[PDB]
Amino acid sequence: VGIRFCQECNNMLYPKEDKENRILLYACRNCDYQQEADNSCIYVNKITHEVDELTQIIADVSQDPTLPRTEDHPCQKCGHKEAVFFQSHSARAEDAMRLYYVCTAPHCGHRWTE
Amino acid sequence: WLLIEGHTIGIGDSIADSKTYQDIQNTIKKAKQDVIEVIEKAHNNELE
Ligand SMILES: [Zn+2]
Ligand SMILES: [Zn+2]
């Protein structure tokens, strides 16, 4: 899910369980700091990468001069009936050519795909 | 004998009839429209 470091020793932390209370106790191995695992999760791996690119498309690409511009498909939060589209261009992320749209208002940027 | 008959090649051998040009332009326009259609399908994700 993530990764945590010390509170007083500025060092990286590994996972470990409690022999007595039977709880995942993230404990420093370079030092003697411990904490209870609120998440109760240790590892996750999305090998096929279902995670859509929308989580990381930057908003300022809209004001790139060289991309296309389409009048249709107005934005949701603001009407602003003109936006830009461009393919994923991300090798191995997914083999779907779904066009990604981003609104081109000065302060907007609500992104969507359809 | 070719001295008598003679052979040549020129612009007149490269110009075609106006009807031919119109048909050729129509064919090219139809092909461009068809590829626009298929790329539109690919963009909208229906090209199986
Ligand atoms: Zn330590
Ligand atoms: Zn917008």
d(CA B40, CA B48): 13
Q: Which phi-psi region, left, alpha or beta, contains residue A34 (left: φ > 0; alpha: ψ -120 to 50)?
A: beta
* A-B C-beta contacts closer than 8 Å: 6
For CATH 2.20.25.10, list the domain ranges present in chain A: 46-114
Token readout for A26 is 């993230």
The verdict on whether residue A41 carries a ligand-binding annotation is no
Identify the sign of the CA torsion A40, A45, A48, A54.
Answer: positive
Determine whether the interchain pair B42/A97 forms a contact, defined as Cβ–Cβ distance below 8 Å: yes
CB A96 within 8 A of CB A46: no
d(CA B15, CA A68): 39
Contacting residues for A50 by C-beta, under 8 A, at least 6 apart: none
* Resolution of the structure, angstroms: 3.4
> Which class is A46-114 in CATH?
mainly beta
Which residue reads 């695992």 in tokens?
A37
Contacting residues for B5 by C-beta, under 8 A, at least 6 apart: none
d(CA A84, CA A103): 7
Burial label for B34, CB within 10 Å (0-12, 13-18, 19+), is exposed
| The residue count for chain A | 114
> Which of A99, A100, A101, A113 is the best substitution to test chain B (most B C-beta atoms within 10 A)?
A99
Quote the DSSP letter at residue A86. Answer: E
d(CA A16, CA A93): 33
Could you please report the per-residue DSSP string of A5-38? Answer: B-SSS--B-B--B-TTT--BEEE-SSS--EEE-S
Of the candidates A93, A92, A91, A80, the residue with the CA atom closest to the CA atom of residue A101: A80
The verdict on whether residue A28 carries a ligand-binding annotation is yes
Residue A85, helix vs strand vs coil = strand
